[PDB]
Each structure stands twice: as C-alpha cells, then as structure tokens.
Design a protein around this nucleic acid. Structure first.
Lengths: 634, 61, 110, 339, 135, 62
RNA sequence: GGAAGUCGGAAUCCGCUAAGGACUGUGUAACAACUCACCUGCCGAAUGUACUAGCCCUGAAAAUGGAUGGCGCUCAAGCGU
RNA sequence: UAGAACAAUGUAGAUAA
RNA sequence: UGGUACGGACAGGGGAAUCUGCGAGAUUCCCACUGUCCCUAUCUACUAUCUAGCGAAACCACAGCCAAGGGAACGGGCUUGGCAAAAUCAGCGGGGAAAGAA
RNA sequence: GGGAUAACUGGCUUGUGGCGGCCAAGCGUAGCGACGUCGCUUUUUGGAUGCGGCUCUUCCUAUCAUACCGAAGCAGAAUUCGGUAAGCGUUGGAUUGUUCACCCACUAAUAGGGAACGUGAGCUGGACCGUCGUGAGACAGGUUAGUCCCUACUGAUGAACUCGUCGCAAUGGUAAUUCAGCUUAGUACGAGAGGAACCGCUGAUUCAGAUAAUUGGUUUUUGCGGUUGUCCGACCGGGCAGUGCCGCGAAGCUACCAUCUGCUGGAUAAUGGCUGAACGCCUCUAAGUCAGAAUCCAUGCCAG
C-alpha cells in the first residue's frame, strides 16, 4: 500500500532571487554580560551572516537572511534578542517569539539560547508537540520572556488560553522554507494576524520559495533581505564536465565516473576525505536505488533523503563528516537540511530543473580557494535545461572536442564516455538487476518515480528546446569527452568516420515495401519526403535585459477557532485563580506550584499498584507487602 | 438474441389522446406549410408533360 | 527482453469506432428537454470530456508503448533506423502527439 | 437471507416429510428407501484418513459426529399409489393384524380416556375369512399401482423417552416390479426391520428434520432437508463394545459417562453420522437415501475409526470409563467407609 | 505473482489490519504493523486478518533507524489468538510474531528468534530452513 | 470458474456416476437387498383374486 | 540483391486467330504451376440490368407487471376495392 | 389504582474514570 | 568578580514475566500528546405485554386492493383487465402530506 | 409606470462538426440535391469544475469480472476488438470548498444508470409603503405573506366439512459464487527468455441453511470461594449498600472466535455444422436436422 501513498517526500526546492525585489563583537558594541557569554561559548569572530545581520537587527530593521544551515543563523538572531531583552520583566506578557519547524530544531534553538544567555534572568519556554498541554499551561503561568515554539502547538495553546500577544515585539521565523514545505502557511498567517503590527520581524532561511516571498511581502515592514556573495559567483576554482548519457546506460556511466574518472577506492576508508563525493539525485527512490547499487558495487555510501528518520540522518551525516563514508547521496531537500562540509567531488545524477539549483549544488564545493570537481550526467531530455544553465552562467558551450584544450572550469564542456568500459559497466548493471530481485524492485520503483517527476517537473524555454534540437542534430553531441585524451580522439576517429556514416543512413525503402498498407507507406513517403555588427555600440537599445480552516494535531479536519474549554477545566482541576493579566506581577505561589522539574525530563511516568497477592502464588507474602506499600504511598 | 426465452417490455400500440391530437395538429401544420411553399414555388412549370406513351408490350402498338 | 508487449494500434476508422462506442455505451444517453439547463449542460460536458480522455488515453498508450530510439543501445538504434526509417517513425509519433494536444484543446474550448 | 426459504414459517408437522423419494427402476434389487431415528447427541472421534491428494492424507483427523438412536422399526401397512393427470394418488392401503399400542396411541389424541376401539373391525376383517377382501386389496395394488410404500413405526417403549406415542410414516420400496414389491411388503408385515439393513457403514445419506425453535417472525421450528452426510458407523447395541475400535481394546458403549445430557442411554441399534444434523436431542429424525448417484470421492471413502469419545458431556470430563476413573483415582473415604 | 499461499486450511484469524507485531528475525526491526493482507476478501466493513502462514504487508515502527519507516512483505510465524489444528488440538502462542520475507518467499535475515508455526514451516520452505524450533 | 450448472461439468459428473459410484452403490444395494430379503423370509369373488368394488363429480348430473 | 503479367513508375503493340489482358486473383526468393477475362464442344429455350408500385423486416431502446379495450385472430377476426 | 409474565432494558445529553 | 583543571554524581522508576544456585542474581516485554473517532464506566430523562376497576381526545362527506387508459404534468367513484371467502392478534420500515413557476 | 406573457418537456433522447468548391439520381425545364473528395480548423522529428455525501430494496443493459463464441503475428504467456449474455459479484488511497481527470493500491473485477415537475426508503452536512438626499442611497421608520385510523407486507390464530392418521401437488418462491494448489508438465510451443490447456484430485473467499462433540466468551444458579463499610452484646450464621467488589463457574445460549452441508435433466442466444432448393455453380434454411453460454424451463429445495 504505502508506495507513493501520499507523494514523493522530496517534492522540489524552488528558489527566487527575484525576491531581491524586497528593496568583532566588542566592535559591534554588545553588553558586557553578553560579551562574557559569547567568550565562554567560543564565538571569537562572528560568521558572515552574523556580521551582516546582527547590526541591522540592533538597528531594528526587519530582515530576511539567505544562509546555509550551520552558518550560525541561530546565534545570529538570538544574540540581538538577548541584547534587546537584557532582563526579566516583572510585567506579565512575553515579547520574544520564534517559530521553528521541528522539535529537534526547536531543541537546538533552546540549547543555543540557554548557552548564550547563561546568567541573564530571561525565562525561555519550549512549546512543541508531544509535551503535556497542561505542562505548557503551567509554563505560560510561569510567564516566560522567550517562546520557542512549533506553529501548530502554538495555535493550540493560543486558542486554549486566548492569550494576549500584544506584548510581543520580537518575532522570528526559523527555516520558513521548511515551514512552507511541510505546510504551515494558513496557521502562520493566523499567527501573523494575532501578532501586533509594532514588531521586528526576522526570517532566516536557505531558500526563498515564491510562497515565502509572498508571505514576506504580506507580513514584513520594509524587509532588508540580505545574503552573501558565494550565492552568485560559481567559485572559478570549480571545474565542471557534462556527460551525454543514455537512460539504460545511466547507472553504468555513474560508476565509470566513480571508477575511471575519479579513481574512487573501494571498501571502508582506512573532516572529509580526499575524494569526498556527493551525489545529487531527483527523488528518494533514486536515492535508495543508487545507494544500494553503490553498496553492492563496494562503495562506502551514506544516503540522506527527505523523509528519513532524525536519528538515521544524524548518524549518516556524522559518518560522512567524520569520513567513515566517502560517498553521500542526497536529493535536494535533505541536502539543504544537512550542513555539508567542504567537498571536492560533486556528481549531479539527475539534472536540476533550475540553473540556480545547479548553482547551489555546485557551490556546495570548490570553497575557500580549494579546487573542486563537478561532473553532471545529462540526457537529451535534460539538454534544454543544460542550455538554460548555459544562459544563466553566461559561459561558452564546447560540444565534444570542437576545441583541442577546452577549459572545463570556465567552459561548459559536454561529451560522451569510453564506449569500451561504459559497456562493460552497463553489462554489470544488467547482470545485477537480473540477479538481485530487491534491486530490480527498486529499479522499477525509480522508473515510476522518474515518470511522475518528469510529469510534474517545471518546463524549459522554447529557444532552449529549439537549440537543443539543433545541438542534437549537430555532430558535437555524440563524440568523447575532452578529458579522455587526444590519443583516444585519434583511435575513436580511426573508425568513427565509417561508424557515423553508417548511423547517418537514409533508407531508400522500408522492409514493409521490401498491399493497401504498402501503398499507404509509399504515399506517406511521397508526402513527407524532404522539403525542397552594423550598429552603434554606444546607443543600441537591446532586447535582453542588459469558518477558516486549519489542520489539527490529530490530523482530522478541525475548525480554526475551537475553544474546547479544557483550559478552564485545567483551572478547575487545580483550583487555581484568575491568570495574571498582561502587566500584572508574576505570582510566586503559582510559580512554585507549577515551575519546572528538577532537570532531566524523563518520559516513563506510570506508577501502577501490583495485582492482589494470591495465597497459591509463590511470592504471596512479598506481593502482599508490596501491595501494602503501594496503598501506603497511595 | 434471446427474445423468445426472455422477452423484454412490450411496446404499447394503445394510442393516447394526447398523441392523437398532437399528430393531427402537426399533420395539418405540415399540410399548410406545404401549401405555402407551393405558393412560393421558386421553380419553373411547363404546359406539356412527358407522356410515356404506348408500352412496347401492347399487342397492337 | 523484447517489444512483443506493445499494444495493437488500431486504424483510423477502428479508433473512431472504439472511442465513439465507448462514449455511447459506458455513459447514459437519455436527457430530456424538460430537465434543468444546468443538468443538460452537465450531461453534454460529461460526454465531451469522456470522449476526450478516452482519445487521450489511447494516444498516450501509443506514445509510451513504442521504444524511444534515443535510449536504446546503438545496435538496436541503428537496426531500427535501417528497418523502419527513424525519421518517419518520429514524424508519425509527432503527428500522434500533436493530435492528442489538439483534441485536448478542442475539448476545453467546447 | 435466501428467497428460497423465505416467507419463513413454522413447520406444519413435527415429524418432517420426505417430499421426494429416489427415482425407481425395475432392474435394481428390491429395497426400502428411508428410516426413522431419535437424535441422542454428539461425540468426538478421530479417523485414520485415507483421502488422497489432501493435506491430512495418512494422518489422524479429529471430527465431530452425531448419534441417532435407531430402534428397529415395525412394518404395519402397505400403501399403493397410481399415476393420474393430476399427480400421484393414493389408490389404496392395507393394514396388518395386531397393531401395536404405540401406533394406536399415534392414531388417538386422548388415549387415556378413550375406549381404544381402533382397527378392531379391520382385525375382524382379517381374522373372519374376509381374507378375500384383504387379497382383493392386495391384487388391486398388484395390478393398478405404480409406486408402493410401506407403513412403519418406531418403538418409543425402547427409546428412553417420556413419550409413548410412536411415529408412523411411509417408506417407499424401490428396485423391482410392483408385484415383487407388494409381495415383499406383505412378507414384511408384523416383522421388525433394522437400520443396519436399510443403511450400512460408509454411505452418504440425507437427514430430514425440524430446526430448533429460537423463540422465548418465526426463527426456527423450520423443516429442513440436509443432504450428503457420511454414516460413519452402525452400532448393534447388544455388542457391548460399540464404542470400541480395532486400535483401542476398550469394552465400552456409545453412551457417554453419566449418560447423554437430557436424553439418556443408547441401548439400541444406533447410527454415527459425520457432522451436524438439524433438530434438537430426542427429536424425530428421517433418514433417507440420496436421490442421485454421488459425484465425489468422499462418498466412496472407507471410514477407519480409531476411538470414540465416551467422556462426560455434562462438563469438562476426562475419563472414558468408570474403571478408568477409579484406576486413575484410587480409593476414597466413601469406598472405605462402605467397605 | 500475488503472495497467496496454496493448500492452506481453515484456521481462526486473530491479527486484523493495522496490527502491532513482534519481529522474529535478525533483520534490524523490532515490531511490524499489519496494514494489508494478501488474498483477503473485501466484505462490507469487514477488517481483513491473517493467520499463521499468511503473507501480509507490514511497516516497521521501531528498530534500526536505517530500516525504520519502511514497508516490506512479511509472513507471520506466531499467533497468540488460539486456533485449532486438524488433529483437533487448539493451540496459541505467547505473542504475535512474523518475519520479513520477499515476495518470492525468501527471508532477509539469517535466523529466527523463538519457535515457528507448523503451518508457516510447511507453506514456506525457506522458513523451515531458517527455523530452529518448530511447534 | 465454471458454474455448478455447466454442461461440461454435468458431463463429467455423468461420467463419474456411470464409471465408479454406479458400481459401488450397486454392490452395496445388492448386499442390503439380500439382508432385507432374508429378513422378509425369516371362486374368484369369494377368494379375492377377482378385483371388485369395495364396500363433487366429473360428469354433469343428468 | 532478386521482380519473367501479378513489391513498384509509364506506355500498354503486333501476329495466330475461335480467342486470349504486356494480365483478374492464388502462388515462388525468382521461376514454375493454378486460375480469371475471352473462345470452342455438349446441353436446350428463355433470359438479365437498372428503376417503379403494393405488403413485410431494419431504419434505436432503458428502467414496478400490462395492454389494437381484453381474449384472441394467419386462404384472418390483418390490408385494398 | 392492584395482580400475572419475564423484569434489566434502550436512546439522548452531560461527566478527567 | 567570573572563568580554568582535578575528583564525585547525573545524563531514573513503576508493572509484568522468563532462566540458574533469597542470591553483584542473569534475561525478555509496556509507559507520548492530540481542538480526532469509537467503545467501556457514572449521573440525569423518557422509556411497559396481559388481567380487575375507572376511562378521554384529536379526527370523521362516503369510502378505502392493484396495472394500463381516462388531451386540461387530475383521480377515489369511469372503461378492461389482474383478481377476489368470515372474524381476529403481534411487528411496521410503503400509500392515504405537500409545490406554483420566473 | 402601463401592456402582453406566466412555467414547462412530454413517441422528447443517443456515435460520427460547420462552412465553400467538384461531383451527382431524380425532380424541374436555369433552381433543389445524398455519399464521397478537396480547402480552413490542421502539424517535416514523440487542469477543468464554482449543492454534496452514507445504509438498504427493486428494475434496465448502454457488460468491469466470471461463461461461451468470431477476428487479429494470435508461436506459448499475457492480451486487443467485436458478438450472445444481467445468473452471479462489483472498491480504497492522494488532492480539492466538492467533483472528475491524472496518479497511487488491493481485488476475479473492484461497470454505467432509473424509482418519472417533490428524481426509491431513511439519514447528514424575503416585499410594499413613508421621510430625506439624486452623479450614489440611508432609516431600531411603519406594515406584511411563511398550514390515530384506512389499506399493503408478513408471520401467528381461527368459526363452517364428525374428529383423527397417512398422503397428492395447482400455484407461489428458488441458490449458489469466485479464486487457488497437486497431476498433466518444465510437457505442448519457443533461438532464447520463458511457458499452457482438457480429464482427474485437494482446498480456500463470499453467499445460504443448519449445529454445539470440542474451543473461547456472557452469570440472577446471586452455585462455590475471597473481601470493604455498618448492624444482630461476641462466635457460627447472617441483613443492608435499588445484584457492594473480585476469582472460578456449570446449564442455557452463543461465535467463519467453533463445527457440518449446499444436488441434474431438457430447450436455446451468439456461433459452428449436415442434407439440400431458391439460382443447372454455390449456399447452415427455404422444407428437414446436429451441436453449443454462468442463458431460459423444470427436478432437487421452501411453502401448501
């Protein structure tokens, strides 16, 4: 049943830099306590995102930050938060609020904020699913200053207390790209409607989907969207090759890359490795298929796909960063989620629809002046997207071996592969598919996924399609890759002449002509036989540019505003009094009644009395005494 | 077809009064329309008609 | 493995008869003038749409059953080129695709 | 449910009627078709299965069987039927001498206050040289009739029941000329016929009964004719080892320890039949032959028993005989106090 | 080919759709979750169920994280709901347990923890090979 | 599957009835008939040989 | 590549004639072979192409069981005078 | 208003079990 | 005043069980929330066949079995057809109620 | 503001477009004109939608499956189209306000409709006046329409034939369905890959009718045993807590939670034939006749 039960978990990662249409620490001037906390943490120099963002946040401007995971966005918005709050407030009502996608991300934010505010009297609360709604009631009674929450639970508690958020002045959206991918849009909009207009809005993300751009335009007051510069210029130290590959030879071509074009050692390796190969794919089914195929071939491979378990992703990523696995296969969304260290080797299995997505996946490497390699497998159907990539990068295309020494780093050089081994590899793939049934089932699943992904993938441009047809007609599509060698160029050419002049044959008559059908074919042939600078550069205006609905926790459809009253019943349960209205001093007796446990939070909390002792049972008196102890504890 | 073993619903020949009135009215209407079209008559008419003549099988032709 | 599983391709008249019989026999065919104009519209648009997806399904089966010359092994590609004139093969397949598209557009407009 | 059995209605009669006897041809030998019995209960057996092609071939399978006490039936009449454009018509019937008190009670409704004057003039007809009349009726059956049936009744006095009123029915004679079957019946007058003679071991037969009422519209008391039930054993009652097999040498009767629940003890000829049977315990059963020749290997199988359960049915019981119980148990306070 | 066993006799089904199960092999999963039963007959609101030796489709709920949240065919080897064998013996097991098996009938693991049902051992020859206790 | 009323199934059942079950039932019938036969043998007007009369309507009463 | 009347394009003649097409189909890898067109011998007397006019079948049908008023009617108890 | 039959039901709404 | 290294503790219970001779005793299984559904449990209200006695009301032109036809989306009484046998009891899920039209 | 109109479909509907030219039988003495063909739509490289949704009865066939046929490069296997056929069965996920399409899953397959202007039975989710503005309207200003019986189904009784016993059978109802495994057989067939069917045998799904040996479950048996509050002066023995609670618990009853049983003749539709005229060839049809579908009619079965 649950094969494609809902949808391919990694859908797409759409990015819009047209969203650009929005518009030391001591030298930055932080408080002494915050400075000592940062010194304890070890943030000697702020990361580039911090350096560009924190001054703006201190200048009280709403900002959207394009930054990779692990760039330090968490501290980037927590340090200004602590600097702004700087003390616990005796007036009831919180003013710091952050919305995070998942509980793990929320806990990471909790750890960051605690370590960055050790000593300061700020009260920070976590509000995520799986915890007791009563416990969250008690924490709101403790009256925190900072709220770190997941939006669904946030609305649940919002509806349950009818809380007043007018005191909130500081609002942060962490990983809003994940928020919108998981589908938090409507409830986020209702949160925004609840929030007072007089607030400072921070939004940290790695990508800017058009939905997120519209949300920012709707909810942000003059956003000074930010970004870096490694998110534009493909590091010139990146050297790229493109391989014309066939559908049935795709896996064989991927291993020739690994074997003869990369010299990838087999077995467990004896901080990434010297090789450091990442593989970017189209869906999780390709992820599993390629991972298992590589593992059978003998390659130390870790796989990370979209809807993978948290612990599993953690283990695989930790192995890749420690160098226990040298190949890492990711789709797009898992890649964006995981913090990828410096890489030397990038392989694009399925071509990306967006040249900007290609730019991200290749800026994954060739960093800090260290040279990087990018090999991309392209098919005839993906050739228009390759040409769109050409237009985006403004580089020249070299097809096959039109130039003797093409510069693969600055030129987009496309070629085929060593026919000899390519075939010895494709035969191996066919053999393993015929032998291992699990691999065959996986291959069929990825075939269906390929069909679905081709159906749902965004289209190319008309000019790209036309010139793709022209390239396919041209000779440059079918010869070797410049890398191989001029001697190969010699030997390939020794017979390529006759081979090509055989491939380019126009039959005089079909085997059917060799009846009414024969007459129809002859008429068909007769019908469809072949058909018989000067400008001023200074001023030449050119053409190209230079009851509302929300989903509940149970998943069953639930109305937007449904006050179950169980908060009032909570009040009745624990005989409490009226909650402190916004502004009134925190009530220490209620704080002591419901403040917090003694530290570590266990989960295993059932105290059940044992069954009544039986005389015929062996441990009669012992069971009787434990039952007596249980009734004494009550 | 298995009409003999499993006959279907019969078609009633019992004419309803609603149908008899409607068919009489539409017959009269068609006759009047034919008369008006014949009055229009965008066609030529001759005096002498093509007489077929005596059949070849007449014994005394 | 082979190409013996490609479904038979009907002629033009057989195709028209298949599609126009399926739409005749798989949907109700009695609506009355004394019914609501909305229900008359629904009935006729159901007929038109059903004919459209029937034609589209058959054309899609034709387009996806036949092997692609590009992704074949070079021996098979050249063999089929010699035996079948891949140029005419692609031309006929393109005619099928264009007819599918135009049928879809006709259905939408009507 | 099934529109075949609906409108659902109480059975018009408690006995249950055959409604169809097997088609008769002269070539077969002369035989009776049906029989009567009283349901005693059910027990458990095991069978050395010899079904080829089955998963349980050459293995031991535990099956549930039903016991019907079948005291010998007494023949008291002979009925002659004729064929007419309106159907079968009971042309005549001939009764015997010395009708039993139980069948006379069947004829009477209030037998205790009645002067029991039934069939006295018929007995005088037989005994007073109106044997001319008896033979006249017999010859009329000889030369005018096509199908002939025999009136037979059970022995309530032998069945351990509070009733005293016997059950009379017609059992058709098949396989012979009308003359041969009329002579056969006249010979069978005033003689007991046995269930081991009407049926035998290994013979799938038909059981006709009235279902158990489920009242305190109609649920139950419904006439049913259940087909294809393999008779597994015919027990002699006086054999003293009815429940014994050749694998276990235990001298025990079919009656369980303490007797059948709500029925009693089976001391007569009995039939052990595979599966379930319509009707409650002590209800009248009708046993007839299959209307058609069988089409299954299950019909030609030979049932090899291994043992028959004689444990107590009144509760979780576990001893086949009182001897087994006393050997497992030893001696008790009551036994030593009595001794 | 649908994984419906042939020659299986009648026995009581006590593991309906959506049923939590222990995992008996060394494959890396601890529990399974029956979601569908092979060879079942869709009745009005009737929940499909399977007995010992019947193939089902199960999703792992706990175990090795790499295999977690994955769906595999399985065949059940132990059933706590009592059922009768043709020798007249009503029997039941301590828990509900099965083994992950490919559609042909081969096990992913190499050993089975605990006893294996006689019906499963007879129906699937591979389980008879990977079984140490048969009852 | 073929129905219980299929012609070919009926022909197969007829062959089975004629070839095996027939002989088996004939043999058992002979045995039981022999047993029951053994258990059994365990002027015209004043004699009864001349069958005479004992002791709504179809025709219209005249 | 092979194409002999018959995978294809164009012309499509003459002789012998009773008559026979540079061939109407089957068939061969090509032949071959059969067959049609046309002609002769036997048979022996009316045929055979296209239209018209009556009656009849078809020319479209759903959903409770029923209607020339019903039974029923066939050299009629139907149709025409 | 009192006897007999079987007499512990069902539906609906609330209720932290 | 706050950090730095060293030493110790933390990152635990409850219930059910299995195996060896109470035993450092060894081994196996279950503890989450949800504005979600259902079920079980408590409370509340209405819930009732016959018999002795007493004993209304609404409603009521007369009636009350079906199918086709009865031009006026009209049938209950008419045509022609199916048919059709007293008097009751219980169950009741069908009919005997509906438009007015821009 | 006045006037007409005031509902409306009712042998209605269904599969094959319109325009123009050519051609064209008739008719007609230029005009009308079917089928085809040519030109446009239309080609030389593979989201729409803006009242819906459940349980049960019955009917249609415009048939998805099961049954039987005819045709197809139909080798086998899997199929495609078409014909007879309504006996028997006939879904679920994803998304959307909803629906379909597409896609995803089992399954033999998971067809489409009717219950007649109220679309089977049950259930669920406004217009008139008045005041004040006229380049648009406002008024907590007033007024007003909103209609327990009869019969049907079906058991269970019942007077008249003297009661009773054993029977016949007019008429009415009707029941079985699908899949799998072994053998055939790794055989026919096939270069290979692969890969059947008939006979025979054993099971399983659903439906239907019974049944309680066995195995589970239910206790007003208040049967036995244990236990809380209170009371009989204490023990025994007990009462009250609208059956105090708990363990076991027969009998009854139950449960595809248990077990058993479900049957055979004739006439046919498509279609395949034999003999043989029409019509000196020929022809399954004209006279005569053979076979053949889960079809039809009956037996088996229930009622009488």
């Amino acid at each position: 049943m649950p094969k494609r039960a809902v949808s391919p978990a990694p859908s797409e990662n759409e990015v819009d830099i047209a969203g650009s249409l929005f518009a030391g620490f001591q030298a930055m001037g932080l408080d002494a306590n915050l400075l000592r906390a940062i010194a304890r943490k070890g943030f000697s120099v702020p990361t580039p995102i911090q350096r560009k963002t924190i001054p703006l946040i201190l200048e009280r401007r709403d900002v959207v930050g394009m930054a990779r995971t692990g760039s330090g966005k968490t501290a980037a918005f927590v340090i200004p938060m602590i600097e702004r709050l700087k003390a616990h407030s005796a007036r009831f009502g919180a003013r710091a609020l952050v919305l995070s996608p998942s509980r793990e991300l929320a806990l990471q934010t909790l750890k960051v904020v605690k370590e960055l505010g050790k000593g300061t009297d700020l009260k920070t609360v976590l509000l995520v699913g799986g915890d007791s709604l009563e416990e969250q009631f008690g924490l709101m009674a403790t009256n925190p200053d900072i709220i770190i929450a997941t939006p669904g639970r946030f609305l649940h508690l919002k509806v349950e207390m009818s809380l007043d958020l007018s005191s909130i002045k500081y609002v942060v959206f962490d990983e809003a790209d994940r928020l919108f991918e998981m589908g938090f849009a409507a409830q986020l909009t209702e949160i925004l409607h609840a929030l007072p207009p007089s607030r400072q809005t921070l939004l940290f993300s790695a990508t800017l989907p058009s939905s997120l751009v519209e949300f920012t335009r709707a909810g942000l007051q003059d956003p000074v969207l930010v970004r870096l510069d490694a998110e534009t210029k493909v590091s010139p130290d990146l050297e790229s090759a493109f391989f014309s590959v066939k559908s049935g030879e795709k896996e064989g071509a991927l291993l020739h890359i690994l074997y003869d074009i990369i010299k990838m050692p087999l077995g467990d390796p004896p901080k990434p490795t010297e090789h450091s190969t990442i593989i970017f794919t189209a869906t999780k089914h390709h992820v599993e298929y390629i991972s298992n195929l590589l593992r059978l071939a003998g390659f130390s491979v870790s796989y990370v796909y979209g809807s993978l378990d948290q612990t599993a992703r953690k283990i695989q990523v930790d192995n890749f960063r420690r160098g226990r696995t040298n190949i890492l296969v990711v789709t797009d969304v898992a890649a964006r989620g995981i913090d990828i260290p410096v890489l030397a080797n990038v392989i694009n299995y399925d071509f990306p629809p967006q040249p900007k997505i290609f730019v991200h996946r290749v800026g994954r490497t060739a960093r800090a002046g260290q040279r990087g390699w990018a090999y991309a497998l392209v098919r005839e159907s993906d050739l228009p997207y390759l040409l769109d990539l050409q237009l985006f990068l403004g580089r020249r295309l070299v097809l096959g071996r039109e130039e003797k020494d093409p510069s693969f780093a600055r030129d987009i050089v496309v070629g085929s592969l060593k026919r000899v081994e390519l075939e010895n590899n494709v035969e191996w793939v066919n053999k393993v598919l015929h032998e291992n049934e699990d691999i065959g089932a996986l291959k069929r699943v990825t075939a269906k996924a390929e069909k679905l992904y081709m159906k749902t993938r965004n289209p190319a441009s008309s000019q790209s399609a036309k010139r793709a047809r022209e390239v396919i007609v041209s000779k440059g599509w079918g010869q070797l890759h410049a890398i191989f060698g001029e001697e190969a160029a010699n030997e390939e050419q020794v017979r390529d002449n006759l081979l090509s002049k055989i491939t380019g044959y126009k039959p005089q008559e079909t085997i059917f002509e060799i009846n009414k059908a024969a007459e129809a074919v002859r008429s068909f042939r007769q019908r469809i036989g072949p058909r018989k600078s000067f400008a001023d550069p200074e001023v030449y205006m050119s053409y190209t540019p230079r009851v509302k609905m929300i989903r509940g926790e149970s998943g069953v459809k639930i109305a937007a505003s449904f006050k179950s009253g169980r908060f009032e019943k909570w009040r009745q349960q624990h005989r409490l009094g009226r909650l402190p209205q916004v502004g009134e001093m925190e009530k220490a007796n209620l704080v002591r009644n419901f403040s917090l446990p003694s530290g570590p939070r266990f989960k295993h909390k059932q105290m059940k009395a044992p069954k009544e002792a039986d005389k015929w049972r062996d441990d009669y008196e012992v069971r009787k005494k434990r039952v007596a102890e249980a009734k004494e504890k009550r | 077809a298995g009409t003999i073993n499993k006959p279907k619903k019969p078609t009633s020949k019992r004419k309803t009064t609603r149908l008899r009135a409607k068919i009489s009215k539409r017959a009269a209407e068609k006759k009047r329309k034919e008369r008006k079209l014949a009055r229009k008559n965008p066609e030529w008419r001759s005096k002498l008609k093509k007489d077929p003549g005596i059949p070849n099988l007449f014994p005394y032709k | 493995t082979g190409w013996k599983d490609i479904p038979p391709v009907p002629t033009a008249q057989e195709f028209i008869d298949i599609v126009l019989s399926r739409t005749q026999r798989r949907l109700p065919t009695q609506i009355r003038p004394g019914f609501k104009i909305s229900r008359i519209r629904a009935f006729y648009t159901r007929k038109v749409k059903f004919t459209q997806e029937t034609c589209s399904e058959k054309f899609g089966a034709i387009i996806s059953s036949f092997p692609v010359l590009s992704d074949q092994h070079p021996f098979h590609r050249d063999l089929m080129n010699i035996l079948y004139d891949a140029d005419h093969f692609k031309v006929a397949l393109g005619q099928i695709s264009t007819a599918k598209n135009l049928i879809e557009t006709i259905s939408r407009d009507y | 449910g099934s529109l075949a059995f609906l409108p659902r209605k109480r059975a018009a009669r408690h006995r249950g009627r055959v409604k169809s006897f097997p088609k008769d041809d002269p070539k077969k030998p002369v035989h009776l078709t049906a029989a009567m019995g009283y349901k005693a209960g059910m027990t458990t057996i095991v069978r050395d299965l010899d079904r080829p092609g089955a998963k349980a071939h050459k293995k031991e399978v535990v099956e549930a069987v039903t016991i019907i006490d079948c005291p010998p039936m007494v023949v008291v009449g002979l009925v002659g039927y004729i064929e007419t454009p309106r159907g079968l018509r009971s042309l005549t019937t001939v009764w015997a001498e010395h009708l039993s008190d139980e069948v006379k009670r069947r004829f009477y409704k209030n037998w205790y206050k009645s002067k029991k004057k039934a069939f006295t003039k018929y007995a005088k007809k037989y005994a007073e040289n109106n044997g001319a009349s008896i033979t006249r009726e017999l010859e009329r059956i000889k030369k005018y009739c096509t199908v002939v049936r025999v009136l037979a009744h059970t022995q309530i006095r032998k069945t351990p029941l509070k009733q005293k009123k016997a059950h009379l029915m017609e059992i058709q004679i098949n396989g012979g000329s009308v003359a041969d079957k009329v002579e056969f019946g006249r010979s069978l007058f005033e003689k007991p016929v046995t269930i081991d003679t009407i049926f035998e071991k290994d013979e799938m037969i038909d059981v006709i009964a009235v279902t158990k009422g489920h009242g305190f519209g109609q649920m139950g008391y419904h006439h049913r004719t259940s087909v294809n039930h393999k008779i597994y054993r015919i027990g002699k009652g006086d054999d003293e080892a009815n429940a014994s097999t050749e694998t276990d040498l235990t001298k025990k009767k079919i009656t369980p320890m303490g007797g059948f629940v709500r029925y009693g003890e089976v001391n007569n000829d009995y039939v052990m039949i595979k599966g379930s049977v319509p009707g409650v315990k002590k209800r009248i059963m009708t046993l007839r032959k299959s209307l058609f020749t069988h089409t299954s290997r299950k019909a030609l199988e030979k049932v090899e028993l291994k043992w028959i359960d004689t444990s107590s049915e009144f509760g979780h019981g576990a001893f086949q005989t009182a001897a087994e119980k006393k050997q497992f148990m030893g001696t008790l306070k009551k036994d030593l106090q009595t001794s | 080919k649908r994984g419906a066993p042939g020659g299986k006799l009648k026995m009581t089904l006590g593991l309906p759709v959506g049923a939590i199960m222990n995992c008996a092999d060394n494959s890396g999963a601890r529990n399974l979750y029956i979601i569908a039963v092979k060879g079942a007959g869709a009745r009005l609101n009737r929940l499909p169920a399977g007995g010992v030796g019947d193939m089902v489709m199960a999703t792992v709920k706990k175990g090795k994280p790499e295999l977690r949240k994955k769906v595999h065919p399985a065949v059940i080897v132990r059933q706590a709901k009592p059922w009768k064998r043709f020798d007249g013996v009503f029997l039941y097991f301590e828990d509900n347990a099965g083994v992950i098996v490919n559609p042909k009938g081969e096990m992913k693991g190499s050993a089975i923890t605990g006893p294996v049902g006689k019906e499963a051992a007879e129906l699937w020859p591979r389980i008879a090979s990977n079984a140490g206790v048969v009852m | 599957a073929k129905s219980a009323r299929a012609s070919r199934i009926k022909e197969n059942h007829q062959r089975f009835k004629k070839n095996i079950a027939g002989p088996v039932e004939a043999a058992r019938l002979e045995r039981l008939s022999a047993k029951l036969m053994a258990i059994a043998q365990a002027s015209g007007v004043k004699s009864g040989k001349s069958i005479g009369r004992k002791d709504s309507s179809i025709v219209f009463p005249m």
